[PDB]
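Task: complex structure prediction.
Instruction: return structure tokens for all chains below.
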Amino acid sequence: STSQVRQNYHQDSEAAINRQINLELYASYVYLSMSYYFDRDDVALKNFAKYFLHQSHEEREHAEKLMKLQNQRGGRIFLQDIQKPDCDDWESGLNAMECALHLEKNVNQSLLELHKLATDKNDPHLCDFIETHYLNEQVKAIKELGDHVTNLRKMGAPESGLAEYLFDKHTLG
Amino acid sequence: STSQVRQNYHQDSEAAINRQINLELYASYVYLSMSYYFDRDDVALKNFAKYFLHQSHEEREHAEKLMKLQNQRGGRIFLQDIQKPDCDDWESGLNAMECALHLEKNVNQSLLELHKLATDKNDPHLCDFIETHYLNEQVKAIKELGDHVTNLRKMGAPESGLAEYLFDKHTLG
Amino acid sequence: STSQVRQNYHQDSEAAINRQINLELYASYVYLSMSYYFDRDDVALKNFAKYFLHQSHEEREHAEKLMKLQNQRGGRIFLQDIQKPDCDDWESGLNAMECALHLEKNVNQSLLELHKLATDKNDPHLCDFIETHYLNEQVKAIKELGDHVTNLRKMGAPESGLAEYLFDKHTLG
Amino acid sequence: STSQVRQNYHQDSEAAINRQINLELYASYVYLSMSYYFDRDDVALKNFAKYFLHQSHEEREHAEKLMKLQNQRGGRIFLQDIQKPDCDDWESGLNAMECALHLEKNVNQSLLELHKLATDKNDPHLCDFIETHYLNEQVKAIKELGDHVTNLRKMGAPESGLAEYLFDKHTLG
Amino acid sequence: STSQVRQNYHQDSEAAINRQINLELYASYVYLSMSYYFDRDDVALKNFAKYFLHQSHEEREHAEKLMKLQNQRGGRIFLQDIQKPDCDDWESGLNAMECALHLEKNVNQSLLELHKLATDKNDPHLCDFIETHYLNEQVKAIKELGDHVTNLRKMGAPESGLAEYLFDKHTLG
Amino acid sequence: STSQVRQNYHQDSEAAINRQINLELYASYVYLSMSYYFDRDDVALKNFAKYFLHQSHEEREHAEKLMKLQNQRGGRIFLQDIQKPDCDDWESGLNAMECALHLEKNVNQSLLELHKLATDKNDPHLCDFIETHYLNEQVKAIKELGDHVTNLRKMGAPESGLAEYLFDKHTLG
Ligand SMILES: [Mg+2]
Ligand SMILES: [Mg+2]
Ligand SMILES: [Mg+2]
Ligand SMILES: [Mg+2]
Ligand code: NA
Ligand code: NA
Ligand code: NA
Ligand code: NA
Ligand code: NA
Ligand code: NA
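Output:
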């Protein structure tokens, strides 16, 4: 039953990786929803839409990289349903950015817990995988989203549609 | 409530489009599963894996194009859960190709039903959208998968692992 | 006696590094033996020979990088005999690949033990050296060798000399 | 009061980062002093001066990268006075190199203590930041300075002004 | 004790040059603080941050040019502590620009006093050094900062965060 | 048992070739040891280190060429342990060069004995192989090392560390 390649790879780590794969796919789905919310004719923020579509694709890349890891270590991928996002209507550029920030912080928390498990199971390869490919990426993403939220709020989002328009143009464009 | 852009776009068409979006996302997820099945160290058919990963990305593109359509017509996207694929282990290159063929024929059937609904609701834009972007794509995909299955079977798949190896090399490589 | 550069570098780490240097040189010698086994006129698998020669040179590079590390930290290199490989005749492409997989897993195990020692001695530089340059390299190498073994077995190695021939051509060529 | 981006970032880590920022700025100031010591008409070792000026700028870069980290994690930078270097007159190329070696080892020790704190606070992002950008840089710098000191001493520095001249020309030039 | 190169270089001029070196280093430190204030996630004015970082580096260049002068004339550099800036939090783009203007005017005043001393000591080389490299630079810098402050105030800074955003984009970007 | 390619290839020649393979691998190991001796922070002669590393790689090439010969003639390679070098610490550039000269002369002597055996066994192919690829290479290497030793001694090695420094720079650099 044991993969010929498997070495120092705990069942708990394999399961946590599968959970992280699902979470990354969920994040991709959330960002896709946000993108096409901004593509609506009654919202019409093209650069918001583009930004979130980019994020969706990036999240899919993260999921695929975790799947690759899983196979590299000799674990077995078990996929689960990708839950629909919490909202169909994201209300505003500012609200979408805040929800994105919350999502990214949740993903970061799950990654940190994964790192903690890896450390406890003395899996330095897994630890450094997480460190190299995920943790700094998350920190950067959270910082960027926080900057976006800060700017939007100072500009007067979400009540200032001019604010969101100009943010779309000058920051995201 | 009615979108300022909406014209000649029936609620039934909007709902059917949302269903097709979900089906395309499901197909993408299935192909992703198949790809990483072939990336396993105990399967190790790199070109099968690449082929199905390409298919996964193509299906994602199809879903995104349907979402774009939905917004173009003034319908509203409602996402649902993306169900996990029917299998974690796809058993063989031949079996994966046969399951892909079945999936593609199911997608084609749903597209045909969508076209029929569009026709009944006198939505020529929707009809020609389906015709231009989806129906021929499906016909080609089904023909290609059928060719693959035919070749594999004649080569001796799935019992001939040499067969699958050489197919991976010479057709998919 | 203490090197002017030495800082936070435990004697146990220095000794373990010297052992790892020897192990890498041993692995380079094993791969050299395998290469020239496949260069024999009665074996004549040129791409197997090339693959293992490449592996031999890579292992030499790994040893030299460990020696460089040793000097960087202010430890002192102590070389030992490089033991001859376990076999003169590696019997088959499949058997050589399986022995290579076993060797790589042994090297990986020694690296993991080195990492564990580094961690206990609170040597984060050494830990990250191992993580960056060795652990992922090992994981990749083990995965690749496992893929090779899987393919060969499915093709019918080692009884199918046609199998090994075609593997030599299409995978390693 | 808590930054919207802050996650898994302990107050003790924030304070230690601020201390490291100050230490890096101090090191920059020390190297600047050494550079312009060698620019004196009664010392006149242009390549020593250039080497230390380069080191000063590198140390400034290190400080700025720590400040960037601080903001990325949602900590707050608190600057302190940059103390003047211990010497105005560094006496010789050899003495300056030895003082530089001592400084680099002190910076390395502070970084190691920072890593230890990060580890205890389960901050893998901070740990890997330190590992990636600082620890190996320090090891290299210490090794290089040790090489310089060794060469100078063997050449006959600091009593052999010919020694220092030729070192300036052939190593640092 | 007297440098072989020293000619027509008064002790008072040497001391004043050392004071100016310290002041330039202080200005560099102030601008660095301002830059990283604007890099905060709760401020997030990237082009303000870039502008002040540029100013910091320019001030360092000015200090280094004064040190070079000091050695050229045969004076001896004596470094002092670089005091921390007056603020950790610069409150706003407008407030930072006003503080920068005040700092630049203080630096200009010190340069003018240096020129006056040089003139009194009949040091035409020192006078023309100051004139060529510093005084016009200061005049330009003060004019630019005044323009920035004027624009920000007219736009509605610091109460209009939209004002500061658009200034960051269109003037500093 | 006899190789299909074997012709005019005596068992004594095959055994002598295996011995020469081992000797070349030993020489490679010796040069590697010397290289990393010179890479030590307390020796720090980078160009000595580079020179001996080059020699190590050249010796490995010589061994591989002998292994290729062995297979070409239909002999069978039998590897033995590679003994550790006689020293961990080579004391000086001059001493290392003298030991290298001694090693090269020993290798040359073994090659000459191999040639003598080949001649007695009327193996003109083997004779001309040795002549073409090895004997002149050895003569050149011995001459070069003798030149190095001569220069170092005249410069004042090993007591003149300035001597070794300048040799490292001007001859080996
Ligand atoms: Mg049509
Ligand atoms: Mg074929
Ligand atoms: Mg790490
Ligand atoms: Mg001849
Ligand atoms: Na992610
Ligand atoms: Na499709
Ligand atoms: Na290795
Ligand atoms: Na530093
Ligand atoms: Na200035
Ligand atoms: Na040789």
